[PDB]
Amino acid sequence: TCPFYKKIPGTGFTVDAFQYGVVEGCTAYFLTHFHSDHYAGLSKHFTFPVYCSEITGNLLKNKLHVQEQYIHPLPLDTECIVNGVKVVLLDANHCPGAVMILFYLPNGTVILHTGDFRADPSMERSLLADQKVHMLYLDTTYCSPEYTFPSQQEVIRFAINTAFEAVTLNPHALVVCGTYSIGKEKVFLAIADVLGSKVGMSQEKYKTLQCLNIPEINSLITTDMCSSLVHLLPMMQINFKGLQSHLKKCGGKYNQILAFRPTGWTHSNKFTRIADVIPQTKGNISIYGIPYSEHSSYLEMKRFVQWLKPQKIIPTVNVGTWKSRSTMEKYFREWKLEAGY
């Protein structure tokens, strides 16, 4: 049944709750972003109101075929009334179209639901600075001190320098980047830009990217693989067997593959810096795992929460085990005692 951490008290609302059938008492279903564990259950047969960003609404219409009459897109950073309740959508710094949602309950309680987010100091100057938040529904994906990772900027700088050097040494090297969802577009776009190429991809992935309101996108992507030297493939294909196979398909246009796998976290983050990352190599194929994250590090999470000073925290990730729940509750108490709220 629908878990309590997906329900907004004092309202008829649910967040990211599309796989339980009809939730009794739900008058409006919000969707924070277009990732499959969050939209799981939506289709052209859905007949309840869905509230979301413009970009998420484009993907619902074009990829899932939800009918336009049930899609209610809202602008960001704007006070809106939904079924009698004031709400605001804020940028979550996750994937394209991802939002956090501020609910202003009739009784005076203010609730923030982060959806999935990568906390950032710039959030401390949004509409969040303007009033107190009592309850926080928090993306706790990486809520443990082992989880450090570099800035997105540092990671993109590494990828751009690595690719440019490789291709300039060998003009017959192909660059491949893995994907299985929206998000992390900066990785393949930044590499293609430094190489003066468009990125080539499947028709299904091209359709997906044309939903994202990315400026000048027609100048940056293409379905013509032959004219491109940065290819996107399914993340499943980013291994030696899949890459050797792909190389055969290019008809001797290329003699070397340099591939990127933008993982979340991996245990080499506890030891190694970004400047010191190395690939796995077999023959003329090299695979780089790069720690490009669209979720908060532990320290980024902690700074946001200690700034916001909520009265109550409700985790939305890692909630399935008692040992995980208890560990998270210990960190929350540490943070509150350190900061004095």
Q: Which of residues 245-264 bind Ni ion (CB under 5 A)?
A: none
Q: Which of residues 103-122 bind Ni ion (CB under 5 A)?
A: 116
Q: CA 230 → CA 19, 216, 233, 313, distances in Å?
A: 37, 18, 10, 43
Identity of the residue, 35 or 118, whose beta carbon is nearer to Ni ion in the bound complex: 35
- The number of beta carbons lying within 10 Å of the beta carbon of residue 250 is 15
Binding footprint of Ni ion, residue count (CB under 5 A): 2
Identity of the residue, 41 or 283, whose beta carbon is nearer to Ni ion in the bound complex: 41
Quote the least distance from Cβ 141 to Ni ion, whole Å: 9
Interaction of residue 139 with Ni ion, rule CB under 5 A: no
Choices 35-43, 212-220, 245-253, 265-273; region in contact with Ni ion by CB under 5 A: 35-43
Interaction of residue 16 with Ni ion, rule CB under 5 A: no
Quote the least distance from Cβ 324 to Ni ion, whole Å: 18
Interaction of residue 35 with Ni ion, rule CB under 5 A: yes
Choices 29-37, 41-49, 74-82, 162-170; region in contact with Ni ion by CB under 5 A: 29-37
Identity of the residue, 92 or 259, whose beta carbon is nearer to Ni ion in the bound complex: 92
Identity of the residue, 23 or 317, whose beta carbon is nearer to Ni ion in the bound complex: 317
DSSP string, 122-160: GGGGSGGGGS---EEEE--TT-STT-----HHHHHHHHH
Identity of the residue, 131 or 266, whose beta carbon is nearer to Ni ion in the bound complex: 266
Q: What is the dihedral of CA 191, 231, 33, 80, to 10 degrees?
A: 60
Range 156-161 contact pairs with CB under 8 angstroms and sequence separation of 24 or more? 156/186, 156/187, 156/190, 156/292, 158/274, 158/275, 158/277, 158/290, 159/187, 159/190, 159/191, 159/260, 159/288, 159/290, 160/190, 160/191, 160/194
Q: Which residues bind Ni ion (CB under 5 A)?
A: 35, 116
